[PDB]
Structures are given as structure tokens and as C-alpha cells.
Nucleic acid binder design. Structure first.
Length: 94
DNA sequence: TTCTGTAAACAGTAAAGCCGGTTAATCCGGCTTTTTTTACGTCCTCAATATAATGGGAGCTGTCACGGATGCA
């Protein structure tokens, strides 16, 4: 499982470096670096699901300024309970 | 020279934080009866009449013929 996934990861890293102006071969260093600092065991790579919901609520209350909460339920289709919890959360943070 | 293990490493089982929807729960404004109270017109109830008035039958019923009582005279 490791070889093909590592190869694709290196391909994407070098593509992103080329897009950003960095030399693609520098990606090897990057992956080597992460291969030193990310080991320890077996765990699947996902995303920031907590951060995904965090930025979702961020966008929700950035678009929210009143009645457009209904538009929020029309934006993607979500509950008013989570929207109200997110509003209270944005009130909590300063 | 031939037959054994062992550490790097990839499948597995279990559990819970979160989570993208799941349900119940209360509060502001409004229409619709639901009942109630007057207004009133209508409906219901009663009283009085001062010339004089003084006894029906109302259509009978149109007809058969047994028996068995029945109560008198």
C-alpha cells in the first residue's frame, strides 16, 4: 500500500511546487522530511473533519446577517439547530 | 554443506467525537367560531262588547240471520 500512495503523494507535491514556482524536485525533500516527522504507526489519512465543520459554521455565519438563515437552509440544506449553535459559538469567541 | 526462528510490515477487531441530519418542545400575532346581551320587532295572551236574543235531535238507520242468554211481568 505504501509505494503507490507515496508515489502519488510525491507527484502531487512536485506539481504543487511547480504551480507555486518552487522546483518540483524539492518535493522529495518535503516528503523525506514528512517521512521522518509523521511516522510511528498505521493510521488512515483523512481531512480536518472537525476543521471541516468549523469552516462550515464560519461560512454559515459569515453569510448569515438575519433572515438569510432560511437561505442558509437553502444554501446546502442543513438544520437551524446547528446554525443557532454556530451563532452562539461565534458570540462566544471574541 | 541443509533445516529452524524474527523483526519490518501490512490486514483485522473495538470504541467514541463528532456530527449531518433527526425529532420534540415553547413563544408572538391573528382568524374564527362560541357564547353572551341588548334592541326590537314579532308573536302570544287576555279582556270586553250593554236592543235583543230562552230546548238538537241531522241524519238517521234501510233492514242477515243464527243461536245464546237474559231479565223481566
Amino acid at each position: 500500500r505504501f509505494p503507490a500512495l507515496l508515489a502519488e503523494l510525491n507527484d502531487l507535491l512536485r506539481g504543487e511546487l511547480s504551480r507555486l514556482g518552487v522546483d518540483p524536485a524539492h518535493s522529495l525533500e518535503i516528503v523525506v522530511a514528512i517521512c521522518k516527522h509523521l511516522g510511528g504507526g498505521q493510521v488512515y489519512i483523512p481531512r480536518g473533519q472537525a476543521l471541516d465543520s468549523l469552516i462550515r459554521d464560519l461560512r454559515i455565519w459569515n453569510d448569515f446577517n438575519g433572515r438569510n438563515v432560511s437561505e442558509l437552509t437553502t444554501r446546502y440544506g442543513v438544520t437551524f439547530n446547528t446554525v443557532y449553535k454556530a451563532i452562539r459559538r461565534m458570540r462566544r469567541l471574541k
